[PDB]
């Protein structure tokens, strides 16, 4: 079963932390994918974006390893992207899924025009960059879907973005940089200070200092 | 660079007559048959997610 190795994992396993948002609010690093399984481990669906063979030339030939790019995320508010290189493809996919779980970020969603219903699109134009690949996400009116290439479309749909316009520049042919750039654009959604986030922050009791005795006696 | 062999392989391929098969549906019926094959029943699958024309 799950024997936590870290303080945050122990707190999560003991029902101490109510939601993943209490991890995100304090920018705590997640070092056990079992936390992601504990919180979203029923609505998470993965997707193997790519399997690519990388080769390193040696004395007697080329050592070939396989790199798996795997995107994960429940199609409501959360998404992650993991890359893992290994000798065996199945091992690479397992490692990529674990890394994708470890990298799951919250996706802030907003409205294009009026504010009826639940959010459907990104709150503003955001941009992610990865090694010459630039991905720009633009709010779109309700019902237009994702106007994008397949690779960013997968990550945007899996992040809960109902409809969105996109632009891309650079060598988007390299799927790894494309995926990392659109993931970066997605993860910048909650770091954009809009006037509705101007209200002064109210500091709450941090998870480590809130259940501090729960670990003192444990 | 001779031109003497111009219909070599096509000329020497053993002719096989086409079988007498039943006419296929056309139009709305064919689309209904495709929809039934692909979305309504899962009969031919083995759980391994192969292709429609897989010979293995």
């Amino acid at each position: 079963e799950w024997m936590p190795v870290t303080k945050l994992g122990r707190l999560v396993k003991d029902m101490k932390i109510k939601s993943l948002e209490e991890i995100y609010l304090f920018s705590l690093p997640i070092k056990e994918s079992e936390i992601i399984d504990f919180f979203l481990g029923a609505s998470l669906k993965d997707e193997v974006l790519k399997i690519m063979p990388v080769q390193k030339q040696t004395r007697a030939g080329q050592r070939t390893r396989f790199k798996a790019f795997v995107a994960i995320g429940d199609y409501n508010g959360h998404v992650g992207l993991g890359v893992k290189c290994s000798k065996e493809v199945a091992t690479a996919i397992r490692g990529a899924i674990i890394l994708a779980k470890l990298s799951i970020v919250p996706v802030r969603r907003g409205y294009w025009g009026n504010k009826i219903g639940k959010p459907h699109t990104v709150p503003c134009k955001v941009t992610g960059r990865c090694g010459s690949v630039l991905v720009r996400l633009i709010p779109a009116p309700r019902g237009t879907g994702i106007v994008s290439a397949p690779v960013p479309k997968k990550l945007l749909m899996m992040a809960g973005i109902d409809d969105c316009y996109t632009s891309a520049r650079g060598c988007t042919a390299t799927l790894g940089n494309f995926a990392k750039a659109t993931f970066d654009a997605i993860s910048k959604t909650y770091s954009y200070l809009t006037p509705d986030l101007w209200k002064e922050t109210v500091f709450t009791k941090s998870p480590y200092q809130e259940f501090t005795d729960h670990l003192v006696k444990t | 660079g001779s031109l003497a062999r111009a219909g070599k392989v096509r000329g020497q391929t053993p002719k096989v007559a086409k079988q007498e098969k039943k006419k296929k549906k056309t139009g709305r019926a064919k689309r209904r048959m495709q929809y039934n094959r692909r979305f309504v029943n899962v009969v031919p699958t083995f759980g391994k997610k192969k292709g429609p024309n897989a010979n293995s």
């Binding site: 193997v48 399997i51 063979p53 070939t64 493809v89 | 997610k49 293995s56």
Partner: peptide, 30 residues
């Protein structure tokens, strides 16, 4: 026939595209 290692020892040969397509079909079949 197994796509998983078919891809592991055919990705450099004439059959790279077919085994890659089959492996992705196994992974996400829909």
């Amino acid at each position: 026939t197994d796509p998983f290692e078919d891809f592991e020892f055919n990705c450099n040969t004439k059959y790279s595209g077919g085994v890659t397509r089959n492996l992705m079909r196994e992974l996400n079949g829909g």
